[PDB]
Design a protein around this ligand. Structure first.
Ligand SMILES: Nc1ncnc2c1ncn2[C@@H]1O[C@H](COP(=O)(O)OP(=O)(O)OP(O)(O)=S)[C@@H](O)[C@H]1O
Ligand SMILES: Nc1ncnc2c1ncn2[C@@H]1O[C@H](COP(=O)(O)OP(=O)(O)OP(O)(O)=S)[C@@H](O)[C@H]1O
Ligand SMILES: O=C(NOCCO)c1ccc2cncn2c1Nc1ccc(I)cc1F
Ligand SMILES: [Mg+2]
Ligand SMILES: [Mg+2]
Lengths: 229, 279, 283, 229
């Protein structure tokens, strides 16, 4: 049965059909079965794609909204359409947050998995913080900071600095520092420290861990180059 | 395989827009060959793809096709190794002799049609470059084809080259269109016309390359000057220089055309005439 | 001029439209381009030396130094050597991955250099991606500018007055040769716009055409223009407007380079730091 | 107002969202007012992308179904998902045709517009045909045939041999002949005839439409060799 739903989610992935995969995974985790690496990875991929499409759309809509302010009431309907997009954007993130609160966080018998789930929670809170403004933005970011800090301690204590999940966590935390908090110095310091630790502990990875780790480190160097200038 | 170090250049055979060909000696075999160097800046994957595409030339064996030994990339240049052609190119002979004799032109057209049909039959390859400079001759009288579009990626690479002076492009090909072998036939016809008269016929009795292209697209096709050529030849070239690709004769019609048959029947000492006109 | 005994020719680099480049060591590392012109006409040689003097007069950060010429080792020109790879190699041969602000800064430096040259009434014909080098990582260095009297052949005392060089960056109004002097500022503007297209696409224009004569005819007829659909999505909208304005078929439609620099400065002002950050990929 | 709806559809197009776009344009069609030349393009592109996504999904699902070649519930579930997406595609096309045979084809003053809409009608009937296997296939196949033929008569009557609309119609009909009816000889004949008729009048090619003309020409050339093999 469970493998049948796994195959259904994989098939929706191959078909580029994601909302089907999002629902097919949300029903899988609702049971509360023991979650393996592939099983959680597929959920992360699906959810990530669904919200990435709409967040890219929102970035485009907001960019168009500020193209010209000296005009008639055409921006009036544009901002309402953006509000529509956010209405179709916040609620999915809330569903994912509720899903994480339901089974994922409690049904965790491996610190690596807890690190991953807290990372995901912070990521989606970050996404909500971009649309969220006012005291709502602060309310969301206070949760993401705490998730990130609780993730970092476990990542440092249980995982090597070269671990791809830990590298991605440091990268995402840095991005959140730069974009929301507007604290580029702290983000740069954190990123430099993470990259230096990764270099100092190198050439000890597994055979499979030779593409993701390198890609994350390359993206880290790219962000360092962007933020130096 | 073939490498840069195995060749000692004897001389520079010639240079065109694409590159330069050197008459060299392959030291391991001790034979003289022609090594064409084409300078281009492309990715290594593109270079490997082009080398693989040129590897097809190993089995393209024809009395109407130049030989081939190998190809490799040394440094920013593609190197192509082919058999050495003593007589060089028909442009060279046009520089030697004022205008080609009609019998020799008929033999040339026979050889070119044979080569084009050999390509289109056993390789599904269009020359795309039928020019006086791309037809080569031997001291023994043979006529062969070179510089035909075997490698599509190589053609894509050479698409980035410098401006030209004169062109052998059929007006359909200039118009972003392609009728298989009819374009090569149009190029053959223009080559035979430019070899019959002692000049480039496109500005019919200089102009920039763009004006030449605009003429060969929007003007009547060139024709041989009447009264100094036989009727079969003029009809053949008028068949070859047709603006509409459908009305333009294909290889089969030209093979049985009267001029080609007359040329085949005639015995011409092409080797002796070549030795006379080039020394 | 310069004595050939002073210079020493190292291994060859490559060949171009009008010369062959070798490495030299005259008073430091230099680049010596051996010209293909075999027997310069005395009027041709006098114009060549006049342009050489004018080029030695130039002094700017984004343009290479023009040491001078020599008439001994055939006819050759000496320029400042640049160790950095050419921009064409970076974008295409190397496929070097540049961020959007990096490309904007490269374009701004190139516009500065071209503005310097045009302020001196010097027409950098053959302006293109191979003529732009990335010195010291990201500094733009412009080369092979001017030299009108050598790149074009001469029919005795008369310049041939025909187009030369790569056609992809060649302006349409100079492809047509509808005027005896089609080279001007706007042709440089068009070539620069093609370079902008390569920057914002990472690929050469007219990738669907694989014959040079077809390119010549279609560009001269106006039937082909660089499609702006290949432009990067993250590319700012005003950047796309600029690259559209630069490659306008109408000569008078193309804006001048002071306007180009002003637009690029406004783009750099508007450049946010939101999309710039990149997050974790779906590994 | 019509202008706001068109601006919204264009905005959703720029946002790479093709569901609010299709619905917005269908609402524009429901107004029952005749389209302009520009507005028709947005409708065509939107409903083209909507259909193409499901077409690619169906292709990959069918490839997986023919690739598994086993005896288990995975094949049955793949078949179920295939019929699900197939039903979605059917609904899309039927909505398109009801939008077309009720507001556009009956009210189209310009014969060029009628050629365009009959081309669309044939295309969508073909999309319905390539998935529908059985007795119902013959009805949609013949309806597509009638739409193509009616468009082809008007094209041969009052259309230039170099207009992009006529060239696209010829290409579409040749593909219909080769794929649906499996009659390669007549498809090649039609492609050759259209090729020649376009070649004849190449000098008449204005700036208004050149890239599409040669693009369809190269597509025809590619189809020709693809079939002459
Ligand atoms: N096998 C060969 N034997 C002798 N000469 C050759 C041989 N291959 C090429 N050549 C010479 O190479 C010269 C240059 O020709 P290519 O390099 O093929 O370019 P092209 O024929 O000049 O075409 P374009 O348009 O001018 S670049 C010709 O004029 C020939 O004389
Ligand atoms: N200033 C320079 N320093 C070092 N290498 C150079 C310099 N200028 C050109 N080159 C190299 O010389 C080779 C050919 O360059 P050029 O002779 O200038 O031809 P091009 O730059 O491709 O286009 P043109 O119009 O001929 S200048 C390439 O490998 C370049 O990298
Ligand atoms: O060399 C070329 N053209 O030179 C004059 C302008 O066409 C040439 C041009 C295109 C091309 C595509 N694939 C190989 N190509 C060429 N090389 C080549 C191919 C076969 C033989 I045999 C000998 C050769 F030199
Ligand atoms: Mg050649
Ligand atoms: Mg250069």
């Amino acid at each position: 049965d469970k493998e049948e739903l796994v195959q259904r989610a994989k098939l929706a992935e191959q078909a580029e059909r994601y909302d089907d995969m999002a629902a097919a995974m949300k029903e899988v985790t609702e049971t509360g079965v023991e979650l393996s690496n592939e099983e959680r990875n597929l959920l992360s991929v699906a959810y990530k794609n669904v919200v990435g499409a709409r967040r890219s759309s929102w970035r485009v809509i907001s960019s168009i909204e500020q193209k010209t302010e000296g005009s008639e009431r055409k921006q009036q309907m544009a901002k309402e359409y953006r509000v529509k997009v956010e209405k179709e954007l916040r609620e999915i993130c809330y569903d994912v947050l509720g899903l994480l609160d339901k089974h994922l966080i409690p049904k965790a018998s491996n610190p690596e998995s807890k690190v991953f789930y807290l990372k995901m929670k912070g990521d989606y809170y970050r996404y909500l913080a971009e649309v969220a403004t006012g005291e709502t933005r602060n309310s969301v970011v206070e949760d993401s900071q705490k998730a990130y800090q609780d993730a970092f301690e476990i990542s440092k204590a249980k995982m090597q600095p070269t671990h791809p999940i830990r590298l991605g966590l440091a990268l995402n935390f840095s991005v959140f520092y730069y974009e929301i908090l507007n604290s580029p110095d702290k983000a740069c310091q954190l990123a430099k420290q993470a990259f230096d630790d990764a270099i100092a502990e190198l050439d000890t990875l597994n055979e499979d861990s030779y593409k993701d780790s390198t890609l994350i480190m390359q993206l880290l160097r790219d962000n360092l180059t962007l933020w130096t200038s | 395989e073939l490498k840069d170090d195995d060749f000692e250049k004897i001389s520079e055979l010639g240079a065109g827009n694409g590159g330069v060909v050197f008459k060299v000696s392959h030291k391991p075999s001790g034979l003289v060959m022609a090594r064409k160097l084409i300078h281009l800046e492309i990715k290594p994957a593109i270079r490997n793809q082009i080398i693989r595409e040129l590897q097809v030339l190993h089995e393209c064996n024809s009395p109407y096709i130049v030989g081939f030994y190998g190809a490799f990339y040394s440094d920013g240049e593609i190197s192509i190794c082919m058999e050495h052609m003593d007589g060089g190119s028909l442009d060279q002979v046009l520089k030697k002799a004022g205008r080609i004799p009609e019998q020799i032109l008929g033999k040339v057209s026979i050889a070119v049609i044979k080569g084009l049909t050999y390509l289109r039959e056993k390789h599904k390859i269009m020359h795309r470059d039928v020019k006086p400079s791309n037809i080569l001759v031997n001291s023994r009288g043979e006529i062969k084809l070179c510089d035909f579009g075997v490698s599509g990626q190589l053609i894509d690479a050479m698409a980035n080259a410098f401006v030209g002076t004169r062109s052998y492009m059929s007006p359909e090909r200039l118009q972003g269109t392609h009728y298989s072998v009819q374009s090569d036939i149009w190029s053959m016809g223009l080559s035979l016309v430019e070899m019959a008269v002692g000049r480039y016929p496109i500005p019919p009795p200089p102009m920039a390359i763009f004006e030449l292209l605009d003429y060969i697209v929007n003007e009547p096709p060139p024709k041989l000057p009447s009264g100094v050529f036989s009727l079969e030849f003029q009809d053949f070239v008028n068949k070859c220089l047709i603006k509409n690709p459908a009305e333009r004769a294909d290889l089969k019609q030209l093979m049985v055309h009267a001029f080609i048959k007359r040329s085949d029947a005639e015995e011409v000492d092409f080797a002796g005439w070549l030795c006379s006109t080039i020394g | 001029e310069i004595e050939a005994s002073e210079v020493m020719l190292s291994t060859r680099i490559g060949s171009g439209s009008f010369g062959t480049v070798y490495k030299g060591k005259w008073h430091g590392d230099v680049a010596v381009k051996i010209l293909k012109v075999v027997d310069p006409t005395p009027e041709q040689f006098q114009a060549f030396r006049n342009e050489v003097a004018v080029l030695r007069k130039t002094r700017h950060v984004n343009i290479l130094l023009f040491m001078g010429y020599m008439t001994k080792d055939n006819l050759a020109i000496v320029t400042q050597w640049c160790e950095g790879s050419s921009l064409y190699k970076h974008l295409h041969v190397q496929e070097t991955k540049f961020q959007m602000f990096q490309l904007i800064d490269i374009a701004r430096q190139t516009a500065q250099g071209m503005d310097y040259l045009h302020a001196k009434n010097i027409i950098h014909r053959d302006m293109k991606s191979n003529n732009i080098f990335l010195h010291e990582g990201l500094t733009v260095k412009i080369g092979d500018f001017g030299l009108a009297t050598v790149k074009s052949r001469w029919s005795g005392s008369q310049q041939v007055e025909q187009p030369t060089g790569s056609v992809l960056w060649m302006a349409p109004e100079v492809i047509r040769m509808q005027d005896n002097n089609p080279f001007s500022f706007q042709s440089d503007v068009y070539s620069y716009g093609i370079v902008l297209y390569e920057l914002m696409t990472g690929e050469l224009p007219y990738s669907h055409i694989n014959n040079r004569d077809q390119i010549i005819f279609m560009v001269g007829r106006g039937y082909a223009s660089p499609d702006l659909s290949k432009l990067y999505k993250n590319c700012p909208k005003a950047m796309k407007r600029l690259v559209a304005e630069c490659v306008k078929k109408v000569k008078e439609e193309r804006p001048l380079f002071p306007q180009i620099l002003s637009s690029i400065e406004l783009l750099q002002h508007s450049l946010p730091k939101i999309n710039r950050s990149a997050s974790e990929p779906s590994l």
